[PDB]
């Protein structure tokens, strides 16, 4: 887990400390606020609902009736996506100091210490060898930043995420 | 350079002997599965029958239909012919046994076999005969369709080698033939094999029930003798891509104790007897295939057009994507990628 | 014998002017042959410069598969210094261009597989949504 | 560098001054992207860098589905009309 | 007589339906998905219980980080 | 001058040589009625989309094979990364695929009788 | 029974490719001078080659095992002249 | 009435054992693989001859 | 570097050493004694090629000039190595080199006679041929019985000689 190029030390994407440049896919699910479930559970509600009332507003066949089921059940799956990809982002602008985190900041500190005491890497042991590491860590870093276009996600355990 | 000449020339008489005589073994074969005698007249024991064939054949006169374009309809046997005998420069009959030892023998096999579907289209533009042009589109069609299957299994096998070398994918297969994990693979290539060289079942291309003989409805003499060669080496050479991709090739058994015994150092006789165990194991792989289609061709009636493109484009290929997943996700999970 | 190695390059180039006979051609298909002509004569050039495996890729793709569609559809349709070739033993491992290609390809460059990979969803969405009359 | 580039001019000047047919028109498009890839594929050659030929593999690819599409076109073109009169 | 039950309708119901009435679709998406499950749920298992990943290969020559140590023998 | 390319030269000279052979000593006489092209005896263009949805889809799905020639001549190379993004590709391309299967894309009177009493 | 008419063609075929296999191994030995054959040898091996011949004479695959060269291999080195790729 | 699929005796591995294995097909081969042991019929004409009869015309 | 490409010439330079460069002995065994002394090669010589490789480094592209020393040194560390070789143990050497002749240079073919140079050149020389980079339970496949992988034929002086030295307790 020795880094192979250099990196930043506590660079300032925002007005807030920095708690991890590219944070792993299961730091920024666990770190998620019972406000983000909020938003998850409003784009899987609001997307059907969305089209029940732009079926109420101009109805495809003169007629109003309600939106099948087979629509309904795309609409949940499809806003589900995208409540996740929202909550997604806010996590991980928290990680990057962009948004308020002090709560994420202490649970980061104490979670790194603890891994320390347990003798363990920072970041986990990686599957590949480092230059695959560099690399993976090329690709997935700051990739919210795309998250209109494509999703990407850190699965890699590797060592440049920009701290001491 | 005499050497060069030598193993040449020794080489190509011995495939195209074996063409000439595929033929006198498929109507012999079938002949005793339809309990009669096949040719046993011309020669001895009918074993002159091909040459008698062939020599009648040259002395035919060709005909050259009058809205024809008589150059595309001689030439384009002529170049299937030559590219089904470039096929075989990249076969081994032993380690490093061949006439091209190129690292890249598998791209070549593939592409030129892709270079086989030009006759068929060509044909039925060059006849005008209207038979033939139906025949040639159709024929075009189910090819290109069945070599996509081809090429798919000979890209699942390269997952288990990491090589483009015919020989180290032979090597390889010392642990165990590759058609031992891989059955259902198998199977599929020889469905896809028999189609890809248009052999019944799979005969929609020249089948004389639907359409009057097929695309060489207007050939004649030595254009005839071209496509007829060009269809036996294929038969042969199809086969042996299905016998180094998974059966072993020229792999038969250990015989390390058995030449530690006859032998105390080495010799050209102890070379000559390698050479020939490992040419005998594989001509007798290449005998089960070319008997499993002449077995095949006795047992069959013909698909349809329609049935041939649905089970290619529709059972098969799922099939085969299906393995795609499932072929490198069991490497990952015992950590077992093949290294160069 | 050494002039023939040497010229090889210069004569592919001569050919490969001549076959461009494409222009010409009273027919088409006879064009689309001079076409598959001329791919043959690329095959030949790549290997001169050292790139035979894609020679190989070129026979397979655009002779085996294009120039294939082509034919269908219209029967259907009515510097004169010398480089210092040197040794060194630094890589050790059997690494060729198709397997840099692939490394490359599926690490550095896995974004432009993946909309490669879109770009072929494209290839086969549109024909069907242009030639089909659905229902 | 001379193979390609005089692939590529002789193409595009049977493109422009096509006045016999269209399938000129396309088999100019392929040879043309024919010329790019082999001038591409030499300065991969003479610079020992992989970037070239990873673009021209990338070339194939899309000259391959740029085909595919292309003769789409002229397929749905021909079924209004039944004939191509060029 | 048998038609299209409807996946919606009923999973496990629809299911019994495809690997009677459309064996071949059925059967590939079957070995098509069970490789990529296979491989998220059971690598870790093959870690932790039969054996360990290899360690890996050398690519280049290892060069030591560590300054020249001058040296003494094999001279002039 | 190696085996490879002296075979390689050798097969259509071969041909070319039966081909001269049969020239030289077959007979040649044509005559109209033997030039007519053969029609069962006699002498005497719309086509399906599927024919062209064969050759036209053969094309991309030819690509996408292809396309994993680098990957697996690198595949330990690239490790378990690249083996995740070669999953990506195939599910990508496979769901292309289910478009053409659902479109039913390469294939190609029951009404009762009532009496007005 | 097995019918053995049936079976001399295959054996013709069989007996053909086993001959010529064997021959084939015979002439490639021959060749290398009395050892076996090199397969899917990279540049390593192809350079490893070239200094051989180098080493022992141009005497093909022969070998040598002493340790210090011989005083021609100092000045018997090659590089390659290459033509300008145009 | 013909059976519905849901009212079938064999389970759907079954029938998908023999819808990819070929059963059929390879018994068919069988029965033509045994034919190819069994004596021919041809005779050798014109050193052999077939039946002929007195009322022969 | 690439290889050379459509025509190409071998030439040959005629001129000596300058003078002021040291004079050095050339390792003279080809490749498949090279192959087979290669293990105890680095294994005596691995502090003088690490050297010679760090120089190169830091020469920082001057490296063929500036690490023309410590490169002789690596030079006379393999001929040292290799003389003791040729003295010592050379019947076992020769069994070596010429089985991986026959087998295509694969040490998987020549187990058996590896095992006769290496007890040798342990004994005699005080060289051991290890692996590096494997951890404890990774096991040398040098040193695997009944493998996977094995030879087409085994060699026949290398048998003969592997069951002599079972009887005489050697091996
Ligand atoms: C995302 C949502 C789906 C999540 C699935 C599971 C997630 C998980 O928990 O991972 C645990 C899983 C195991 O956890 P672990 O045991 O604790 O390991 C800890 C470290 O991961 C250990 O790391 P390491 O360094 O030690 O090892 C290297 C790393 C290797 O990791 C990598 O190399 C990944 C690099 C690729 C990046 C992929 C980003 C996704 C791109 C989407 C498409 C982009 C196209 C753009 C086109 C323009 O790990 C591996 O070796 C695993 C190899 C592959 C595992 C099996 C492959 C499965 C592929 C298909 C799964 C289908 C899931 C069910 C259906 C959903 O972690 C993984 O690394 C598995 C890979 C994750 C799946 C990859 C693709 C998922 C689906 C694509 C994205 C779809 C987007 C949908 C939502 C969009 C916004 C709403
Ligand atoms: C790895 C890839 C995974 C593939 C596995 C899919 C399972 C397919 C099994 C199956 O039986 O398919 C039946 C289906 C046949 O259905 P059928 O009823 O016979 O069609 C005839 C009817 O007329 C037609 O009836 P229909 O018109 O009503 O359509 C029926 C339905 C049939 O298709 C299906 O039913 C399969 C859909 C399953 C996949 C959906 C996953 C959604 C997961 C998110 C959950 C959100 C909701 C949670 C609620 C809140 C939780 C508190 O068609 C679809 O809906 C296709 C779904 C395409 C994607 C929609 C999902 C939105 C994207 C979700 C992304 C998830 C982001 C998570 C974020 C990261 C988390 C770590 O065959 C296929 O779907 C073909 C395979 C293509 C699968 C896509
Ligand atoms: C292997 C194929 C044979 C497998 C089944 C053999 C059945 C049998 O012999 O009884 C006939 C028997 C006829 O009864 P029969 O005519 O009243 O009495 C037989 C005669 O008395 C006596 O008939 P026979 O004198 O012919 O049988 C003795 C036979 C051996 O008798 C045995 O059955 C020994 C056990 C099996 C080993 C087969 C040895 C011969 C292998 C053929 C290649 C020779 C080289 O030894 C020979 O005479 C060999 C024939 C002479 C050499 C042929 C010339 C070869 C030229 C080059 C060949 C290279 C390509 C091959 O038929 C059956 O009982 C049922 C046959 C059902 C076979 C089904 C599938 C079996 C396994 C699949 C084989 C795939 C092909
Ligand atoms: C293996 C083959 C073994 C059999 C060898 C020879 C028997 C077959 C010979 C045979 O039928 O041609 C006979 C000639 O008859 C001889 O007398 C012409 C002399 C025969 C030449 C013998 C050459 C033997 C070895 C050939 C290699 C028929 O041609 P023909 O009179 O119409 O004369 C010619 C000839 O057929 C064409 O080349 C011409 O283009 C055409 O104008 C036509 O008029
Ligand atoms: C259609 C035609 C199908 C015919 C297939 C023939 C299958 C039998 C040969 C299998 C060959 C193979 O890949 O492995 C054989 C190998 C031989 O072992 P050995 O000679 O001692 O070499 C030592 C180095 N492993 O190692 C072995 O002996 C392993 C055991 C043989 C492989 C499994 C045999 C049982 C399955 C046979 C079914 C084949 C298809 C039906
Ligand atoms: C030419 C047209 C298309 C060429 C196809 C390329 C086939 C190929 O892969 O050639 C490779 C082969 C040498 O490649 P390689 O495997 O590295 O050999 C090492 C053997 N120890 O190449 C060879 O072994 C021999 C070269 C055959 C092709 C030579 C043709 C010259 C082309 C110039 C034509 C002039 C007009
Ligand atoms: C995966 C990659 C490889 C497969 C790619 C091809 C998939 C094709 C699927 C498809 O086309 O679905 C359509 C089909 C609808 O049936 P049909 O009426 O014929 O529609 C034709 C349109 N006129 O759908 C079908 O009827 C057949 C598809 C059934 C899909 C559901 C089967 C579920 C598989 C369960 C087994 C899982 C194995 C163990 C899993 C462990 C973890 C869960
Ligand atoms: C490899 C073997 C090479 C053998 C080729 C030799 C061909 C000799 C045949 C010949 O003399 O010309 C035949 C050709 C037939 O075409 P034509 O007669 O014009 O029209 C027929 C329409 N029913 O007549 C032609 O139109 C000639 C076309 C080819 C030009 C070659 C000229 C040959 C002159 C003989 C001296
Ligand atoms: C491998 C080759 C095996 C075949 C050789 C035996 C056939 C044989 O020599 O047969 C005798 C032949 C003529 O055969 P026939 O006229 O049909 O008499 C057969 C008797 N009956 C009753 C079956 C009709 O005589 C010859 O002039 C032989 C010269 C041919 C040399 C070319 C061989 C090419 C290889």
Same mark, same amino acid.
């Given at each position: 887990?020795?880094?192979?190029?250099?990196?930043?030390?506590?660079?300032?994407?925002?007005?807030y400390? $920095?708690?991890?440049?590219?944070?792993?896919?299961?730091?920024?699910?666990?770190?998620?606020?019972?406000?983000?479930?909020?938003?998850?559970?409003?784009?899987?509600?609001? !997307?059907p609902?969305?089209?029940?009332?732009?079926?109420?507003?101009?109805?495809?066949?003169g007629?109003?009736?309600?939106?099948?089921?087979?629509?309904?059940?795309v609409?949940?799956?499809?806003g589900?996506?995208?409540?996740?990809?929202?909550?997604?982002?806010?996590?991980?602008?928290?990680?990057?100091?962009?948004?308020?985190?002090a709560?994420?900041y202490?649970?980061?500190?104490?979670?790194?210490?603890?891994?320390?005491?347990?003798?363990?890497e920072?970041?986990?042991?990686?599957?590949?060898?480092?230059?695959?590491?560099?690399? /993976?860590?090329?690709?997935?870093?700051?990739?919210?930043?795309?998250?209109?276009?494509?999703?990407?996600?850190?699965?890699?355990?590797?060592?440049?995420?920009?701290?001491? | 350079?005499?050497?060069?000449?030598?193993?040449?020339?020794?080489?190509?008489?011995?495939?195209?002997?074996?063409?000439?005589?595929?033929?006198?073994?498929? +109507?012999?074969?079938?002949?005793?599965?339809?309990?009669?005698?096949?040719?046993?007249?011309?020669?001895?024991?009918?074993?002159?029958?091909?040459?008698?064939?062939?020599?009648?054949?040259?002395?035919?006169?060709?005909?050259?239909?009058?809205?024809?374009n008589?150059?595309?309809?001689?030439?384009?046997?002529?170049?299937?012919?030559?590219?089904?005998?470039?096929?075989?420069?990249?076969?081994?009959?032993?380690?490093?046994?061949?006439?091209?030892?190129?690292?890249?023998?598998?791209?070549?096999? $593939?592409?030129?076999?892709?270079?086989?579907?030009?006759?068929?289209?060509?044909?039925?533009?060059?006849?005008?005969?209207?038979?033939?042009?139906?025949?040639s589109? +159709?024929?075009?069609?189910?090819?290109?369709?069945?070599?996509?299957?081809?090429?798919?299994? *000979?890209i699942?096998?390269?997952?288990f080698?990491?090589?483009?070398?015919?020989?180290?994918?032979?090597?390889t297969?010392r642990?165990?033939?590759?058609?031992?994990?891989? !059955?259902?693979?198998?199977?599929?290539? *020889?469905? /896809?094999?028999?189609?890809?060289?248009?052999?019944?079942?799979?005969?929609?291309?020249e089948?004389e029930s639907?359409?009057?003989?097929?695309?060489?409805?207007?050939?004649?003499?030595?254009?005839?003798?071209?496509?007829?060669?060009?269809?036996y080496?294929?038969?042969?050479?199809?086969?042996?891509?299905?016998?180094?991709?998974?059966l072993?090739?020229?792999?038969?058994?250990?015989?390390?104790?058995?030449?530690?015994?006859?032998?105390?150092?080495?010799?050209?006789?102890?070379?000559?007897?390698?050479?020939?165990?490992?040419?005998?194991?594989?001509?007798?792989?290449?005998?089960?295939?070319? *008997?499993?289609?002449?077995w095949?061709?006795?047992?069959?009636?013909?698909?349809?057009?329609?049935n041939?493109?649905?089970?290619?484009?529709?059972?098969?290929?799922?099939?085969?994507?299906?393995?795609?997943?499932i072929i490198?996700?069991?490497?990952?999970?015992?950590?077992?990628?093949?290294?160069? | 014998?050494?002039?023939?190695?040497?010229?090889?390059?210069?004569?592919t180039?001569?050919?490969?002017?001549?076959?461009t006979?494409?222009?010409? /051609?009273?027919?088409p298909?006879?064009?689309?042959?001079?076409?598959? /002509?001329?791919?043959?004569?690329?095959?030949?050039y $790549?290997?001169?410069?050292?790139?035979?495996?894609?020679?190989?890729?070129?026979?397979?793709?655009?002779?085996?598969?294009?120039?294939?569609?082509f034919?269908?559809?219209?029967?259907?349709?009515?510097?004169?210094?010398?480089?210092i070739?040197?040794?060194?033993?630094?890589?050790?491992?059997?690494?060729?261009?198709?397997?840099?290609?692939?490394?490359?390809?599926?690490?550095?460059?896995?974004?432009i597989?993946?909309?490669?990979?879109?770009?072929?969803?494209?290839?086969?969405?549109?024909?069907?949504?242009?030639?089909?009359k659905?229902? | 560098?001379?193979?390609?580039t005089?692939?590529?001019?002789?193409?595009?000047?049977? *493109?422009?001054?096509?006045?016999?047919?269209?399938?000129?028109?396309?088999?100019?498009?392929?040879?043309?992207?024919?010329?790019?890839?082999?001038?591409?594929?030499? =300065?991969?050659?003479?610079?020992?860098?992989?970037?070239?030929?990873?673009?021209?593999?990338?070339?194939?690819?899309?000259?391959?589905?740029e085909?595919?599409?292309?003769?789409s076109?002229?397929?749905?073109?021909?079924?209004?009309?039944?004939?191509?009169?060029? | 007589?048998?038609?299209?039950?409807?996946?919606?309708?009923?999973?496990?119901?629809?299911?019994?339906?495809?690997?009677?009435?459309?064996?071949?679709?059925?059967?590939?998406?079957?070995?098509?998905?069970?490789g990529?499950?296979?491989?998220?749920?059971?690598?870790?298992?093959?870690?932790?219980?039969?054996?360990?990943?290899?360690?890996?290969?050398?690519?280049?020559?290892?060069?030591?980080?560590?300054?020249?140590?001058?040296?003494?023998?094999?001279?002039? | 001058?190696?085996?490879? @390319?002296?075979?390689?030269?050798?097969?259509?000279?071969?041909?070319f040589?039966?081909?001269?052979?049969n020239?030289?000593?077959?007979?040649?006489?044509?005559?109209?009625?033997?030039?007519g092209?053969?029609?069962?005896?006699?002498?005497?263009?719309?086509?399906?989309?599927?024919?062209?949805?064969?050759?036209?889809?053969?094309?991309?799905?030819?690509?996408?094979?292809?396309?994993?020639?680098?990957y697996?001549?690198?595949?330990?190379?690239?490790? =378990?990364?690249?083996?995740?993004?070669?999953?990506?590709?195939?599910?990508?391309?496979? @769901?292309?695929?289910?478009?053409?299967?659902?479109?039913?894309?390469?294939?190609?009177?029951?009404?009762?009788?009532?009496?007005?009493? | 029974?097995?019918?053995?008419?049936?079976?001399?063609?295959?054996?013709?075929?069989?007996?053909?490719?086993?001959?010529?296999?064997?021959?084939?191994?015979?002439?490639?030995?021959?060749?290398?001078?009395?050892?076996?054959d090199?397969?899917?040898?990279?540049?390593?091996?192809?350079?490893?080659?070239?200094?051989?011949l180098?080493?022992?004479?141009?005497?093909?695959?022969?070998?040598?095992?002493?340790?210090?060269?011989?005083?021609?291999?100092?000045?018997?080195?090659?590089?390659?002249?290459? +033509?300008?790729?145009? | 009435?013909?059976?519905?699929?849901?009212?079938?005796?064999?389970?759907?591995?079954?029938?998908?054992?023999?819808?990819? $294995?070929?059963?059929?097909?390879?018994?068919?081969?069988?029965?033509?693989?045994e034919?190819?042991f069994?004596?021919?019929?041809?005779?050798?004409?014109?050193?052999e001859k077939?039946?002929?009869?007195?009322?022969?015309? | 570097?690439r290889?050379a490409?459509?025509?190409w010439?071998?030439?040959?330079?005629?001129?000596?050493?300058?003078?002021?460069?040291?004079?050095?002995?050339?390792?003279?065994?080809?490749?498949?004694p090279?192959?087979?002394?290669?293990?105890?090669?680095?294994?005596?010589?691995?502090?003088?090629?690490d050297?010679?490789?760090?120089?190169?480094?830091?020469?920082?592209?001057?490296?063929?000039?500036d690490?023309?020393?410590?490169?002789? +040194?690596?030079?006379?560390?393999?001929?040292?190595?290799?003389?003791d070789?040729?003295?010592?143990?050379?019947?076992?050497?020769?069994?070596?080199?010429?089985?991986?002749?026959?087998?295509?240079?694969?040490?998987?073919?020549?187990?058996?006679?590896?095992?006769?140079?290496?007890?040798?050149?342990?004994?005699?020389?005080?060289?051991?041929?290890?692996?590096?980079?494997?951890?404890?339970?990774?096991?040398?496949?040098?040193?695997?019985?009944?493998?996977?992988?094995?030879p087409?034929?085994?060699?026949?002086?290398?048998?003969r000689?592997?069951?002599?030295?079972?009887?005489?307790?050697?091996?």
């Amino acid at each position: 887990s020795t880094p192979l190029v250099k990196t930043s030390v506590n660079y300032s994407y925002g007005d807030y400390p $920095l708690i991890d440049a590219d944070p792993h896919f299961k730091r920024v699910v666990g770190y998620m606020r019972p406000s983000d479930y909020g938003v998850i559970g409003l784009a899987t509600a609001a !997307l059907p609902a969305g089209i029940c009332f732009a079926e109420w507003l101009d109805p495809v066949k003169g007629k109003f009736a309600r939106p099948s089921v087979k629509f309904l059940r795309v609409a949940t799956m499809l806003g589900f996506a995208v409540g996740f990809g929202a909550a997604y982002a806010r996590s991980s602008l928290r990680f990057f100091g962009v948004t308020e985190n002090a709560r994420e900041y202490k649970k980061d500190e104490a979670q790194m210490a603890a891994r320390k005491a347990a003798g363990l890497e920072p970041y986990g042991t990686s599957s590949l060898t480092p230059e695959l590491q560099e690399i /993976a860590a090329k690709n997935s870093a700051h990739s919210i930043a795309g998250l209109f276009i494509f999703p990407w996600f850190n699965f890699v355990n590797h060592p440049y995420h920009g701290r001491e | 350079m005499i050497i060069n000449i030598v193993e040449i020339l020794i080489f190509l008489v011995c495939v195209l002997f074996s063409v000439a005589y595929l033929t006198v073994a498929e +109507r012999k074969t079938l002949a005793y599965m339809q309990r009669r005698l096949g040719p046993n007249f011309v020669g001895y024991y009918g074993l002159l029958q091909a040459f008698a064939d062939a020599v009648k054949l040259l002395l035919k006169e060709i005909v050259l239909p009058k809205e024809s374009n008589y150059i595309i309809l001689v030439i384009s046997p002529l170049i299937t012919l030559i590219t089904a005998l470039i096929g075989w420069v990249v076969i081994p009959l032993g380690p490093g046994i061949t006439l091209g030892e190129l690292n890249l023998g598998i791209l070549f096999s $593939l592409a030129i076999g892709s270079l086989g579907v030009f006759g068929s289209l060509l044909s039925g533009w060059s006849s005008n005969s209207k038979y033939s042009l139906l025949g040639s589109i +159709r024929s075009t069609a189910q090819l290109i369709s069945y070599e996509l299957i081809l090429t798919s299994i *000979f890209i699942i096998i390269i997952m288990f080698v990491s090589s483009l070398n015919i020989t180290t994918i032979i090597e390889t297969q010392r642990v165990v033939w590759y058609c031992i994990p891989l !059955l259902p693979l198998l199977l599929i290539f *020889f469905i /896809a094999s028999v189609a890809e060289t248009a052999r019944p079942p799979f005969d929609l291309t020249e089948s004389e029930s639907e359409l009057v003989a097929g695309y060489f409805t207007e050939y004649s003499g030595s254009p005839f003798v071209f496509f007829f060669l060009a269809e036996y080496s294929n038969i042969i050479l199809i086969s042996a891509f299905n016998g180094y991709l998974l059966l072993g090739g020229y792999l038969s058994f250990n015989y390390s104790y058995l030449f530690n015994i006859l032998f105390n150092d080495y010799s050209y006789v102890s070379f000559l007897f390698e050479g020939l165990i490992n040419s005998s194991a594989y001509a007798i792989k290449l005998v089960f295939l070319m *008997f499993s289609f002449i077995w095949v061709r006795a047992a069959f009636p013909r698909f349809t057009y329609d049935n041939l493109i649905n089970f290619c484009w529709i059972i098969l290929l799922p099939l085969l994507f299906g393995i795609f997943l499932i072929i490198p996700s069991t490497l990952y999970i015992f950590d077992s990628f093949p290294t160069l | 014998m050494m002039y023939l190695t040497y010229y090889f390059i210069e004569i592919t180039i001569f050919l490969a002017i001549l076959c461009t006979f494409i222009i010409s /051609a009273k027919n088409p298909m006879v064009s689309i042959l001079y076409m598959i /002509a001329l791919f043959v004569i690329a095959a030949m050039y $790549l290997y001169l410069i050292g790139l035979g495996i894609f020679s190989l890729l070129y026979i397979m793709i655009y002779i085996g598969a294009i120039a294939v569609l082509f034919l269908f559809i219209i029967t259907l349709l009515d510097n004169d210094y010398n480089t210092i070739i040197t040794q060194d033993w630094f890589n050790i491992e059997n690494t060729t261009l198709l397997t840099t290609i692939g490394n490359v390809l599926l690490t550095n460059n896995a974004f432009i597989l993946l909309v490669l990979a879109i770009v072929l969803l494209l290839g086969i969405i549109g024909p069907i949504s242009i030639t089909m009359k659905h229902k | 560098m001379f193979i390609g580039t005089i692939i590529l001019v002789l193409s595009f000047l049977g *493109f422009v001054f096509n006045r016999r047919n269209i399938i000129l028109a396309f088999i100019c498009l392929e040879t043309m992207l024919l010329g790019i890839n082999l001038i591409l594929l030499r =300065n991969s050659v003479l610079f020992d860098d992989i970037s070239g030929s990873l673009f021209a593999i990338v070339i194939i690819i899309l000259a391959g589905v740029e085909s595919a599409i292309g003769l789409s076109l002229l397929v749905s073109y021909y079924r209004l009309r039944g004939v191509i009169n060029s | 007589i048998n038609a299209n039950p409807g996946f919606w309708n009923g999973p496990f119901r629809y299911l019994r339906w495809s690997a009677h009435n459309r064996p071949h679709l059925f059967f590939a998406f079957a070995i098509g998905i069970a490789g990529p499950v296979a491989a998220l749920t059971l690598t870790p298992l093959r870690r932790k219980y039969l054996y360990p990943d290899h360690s890996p290969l050398p690519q280049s020559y290892p060069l030591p980080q560590r300054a020249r140590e001058q040296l003494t023998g094999f001279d002039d | 001058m190696n085996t490879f @390319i002296i075979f390689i030269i050798l097969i259509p000279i071969v041909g070319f040589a039966l081909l001269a052979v049969n020239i030289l000593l077959a007979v040649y006489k044509p005559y109209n009625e033997k030039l007519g092209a053969f029609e069962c005896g006699l002498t005497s263009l719309a086509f399906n989309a599927a024919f062209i949805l064969v050759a036209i889809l053969f094309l991309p799905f030819d690509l996408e094979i292809s396309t994993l020639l680098p990957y697996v001549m690198s595949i330990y190379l690239v490790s =378990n990364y690249g083996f995740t993004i070669v999953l990506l590709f195939l599910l990508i391309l496979i @769901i292309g695929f289910v478009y053409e299967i659902n479109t039913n894309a390469l294939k190609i009177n029951t009404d009762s009788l009532i009496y007005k009493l | 029974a097995i019918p053995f008419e049936a079976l001399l063609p295959y054996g013709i075929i069989f007996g053909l490719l086993t001959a010529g296999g064997g021959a084939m191994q015979v002439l490639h030995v021959y060749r290398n001078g009395g050892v076996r054959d090199r397969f899917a040898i990279d540049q390593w091996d192809s350079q490893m080659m070239e200094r051989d011949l180098r080493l022992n004479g141009g005497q093909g695959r022969k070998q040598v095992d002493q340790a210090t060269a011989p005083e021609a291999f100092k000045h018997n080195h090659v590089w390659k002249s290459e +033509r300008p790729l145009i | 009435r013909p059976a519905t699929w849901e009212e079938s005796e064999e389970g759907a591995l079954s029938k998908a054992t023999k819808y990819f $294995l070929l059963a059929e097909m390879f018994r068919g081969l069988y029965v033509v693989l045994e034919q190819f042991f069994r004596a021919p019929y041809t005779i050798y004409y014109p050193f052999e001859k077939g039946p002929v009869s007195p009322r022969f015309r | 570097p690439r290889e050379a490409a459509a025509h190409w010439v071998p030439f040959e330079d005629k001129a000596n050493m300058p003078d002021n460069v040291p004079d050095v002995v050339e390792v003279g065994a080809t490749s498949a004694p090279l192959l087979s002394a290669s293990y105890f090669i680095g294994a005596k010589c691995k502090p003088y090629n690490d050297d010679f490789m760090l120089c190169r480094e830091e020469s920082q592209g001057s490296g063929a000039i500036d690490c023309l020393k410590e490169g002789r +040194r690596v030079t006379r560390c393999a001929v040292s190595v290799i003389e003791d070789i040729n003295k010592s143990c050379l019947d076992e050497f020769r069994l070596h080199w010429q089985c991986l002749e026959q087998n295509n240079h694969q040490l998987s073919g020549c187990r058996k006679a590896e095992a006769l140079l290496n007890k040798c050149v342990f004994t005699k020389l005080n060289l051991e041929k290890k692996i590096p980079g494997l951890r404890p339970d990774e096991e040398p496949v040098f040193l695997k019985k009944d493998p996977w992988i094995k030879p087409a034929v085994d060699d026949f002086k290398s048998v003969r000689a592997y069951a002599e030295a079972k009887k005489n307790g050697t091996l």
